Amino acid sequence: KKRFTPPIYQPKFK
Amino acid sequence: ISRKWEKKNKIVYPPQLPGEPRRPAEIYHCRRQIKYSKDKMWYLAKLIRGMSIDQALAQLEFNDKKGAKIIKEVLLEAQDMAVRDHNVEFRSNLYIAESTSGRGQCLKRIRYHGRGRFGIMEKVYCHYFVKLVEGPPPPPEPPKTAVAHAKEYIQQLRSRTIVHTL
Amino acid sequence: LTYFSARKGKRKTVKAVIDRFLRLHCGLWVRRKAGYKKKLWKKTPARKKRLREFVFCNKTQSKLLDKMTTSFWKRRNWYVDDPYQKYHDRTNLKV
């Protein structure tokens, strides 16, 4: 199939 | 955070004897939290190194960089504090002995790439160290001629002895 | 065989071992040869007599049957009319 992974955003504290 | 460069100007020496040399002076001064890169500051320090203070000021006045004026002001205020507090009479009888750079406190920001990913924007900071010594500047080390190499080779060939027996 | 239960936390036994074997106090298990009651018309009378004999087990089999049981099945019973009473104690044993 059409394999795809969504990106993950880090918290806005670093 | 550590601060040990600004405190070297308080080392008191005992009174000398009439049968002792003059002993040159040592002036320590440095600034903290300077918005600049450490590599460029080290390049400027390598450009300076051991030269006269007036020649250093002349080279920094026509140096097209950001930290040139900063180092110029640092040298100016150091010379002023030397001639006002460190008991220095001559203004042109000074030379930079040590000049290096360090690293300052850094933060973290974002970069925003072309997708969901990003980068770590680390605010680069640095410092600048310099030491002023009175007296005329020492001459540079002259390159050794063929006579020195010949003498060293003769000494090396004369120092070798019998080995692996007695 | 459930080494630790959920109510008493003890050790449980297998009732099949008790219903198919018989442990003596000396450390031997009495079993029965399979097929001693089925298809007896095609077997010689010698085989029929051999299948109807109380055969003992081996070493690993006895160890397995002992591990499948607890300390209750390894005691000594004193029945009034026990036909296997003379087989509990084993005399004349030299290592």
Binding site: - | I162, H164, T165, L166 | -
Partner: protein
């Protein structure tokens, strides 16, 4: 944490004290310094036979050079020295050839004379003299 590690830096220093003269990150990175020190100790332990063989070959080469400078060879010299009831290892022979040339020349002359006597006895299948400097001493 209960009774955790409170003296790990001492082990790090004990491991790094053997890596205070290396080039690169091997003198600072403990993970690589361990392997570097291990290999260094293994090679230092295994190189004893290599050192012995190198010293023996150097002694043999020195003896051969001295014999060629005097006017003989190495196998003939060794044979004549082992056939004259004189037990001198390679070290003392090299030391004499380097420091005491007179005794080495005397040994070379004795070896040449023994070789000539052996050749004469082989060509004559001896009978009567069989070499003046020969005559083995019987120890009972």
């Amino acid at each position: 944490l209960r009774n955790r590690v409170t003296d790990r830096y001492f082990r790090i220093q004990e491991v790094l004290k053997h890596a205070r003269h290396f080039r690169g990150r091997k003198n600072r990175c403990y993970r690589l310094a361990v392997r570097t020190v291990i290999r260094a100790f293994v090679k230092c332990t295994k190189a004893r036979y290599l050192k012995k063989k190198n010293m023996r070959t150097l002694w043999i080469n020195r003896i051969t050079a001295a014999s060629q400078e005097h006017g003989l060879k190495y196998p003939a010299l060794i044979g004549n020295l082992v056939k004259c009831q004189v037990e001198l290892n390679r070290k003392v022979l090299a030391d004499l050839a380097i420091y005491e040339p007179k005794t080495f020349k005397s040994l070379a002359a004795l070896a040449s004379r023994r070789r000539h006597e052996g050749f004469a006895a082989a060509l004559g299948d001896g009978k009567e003299p069989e070499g003046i400097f020969s005559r083995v001493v019987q120890y009972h």
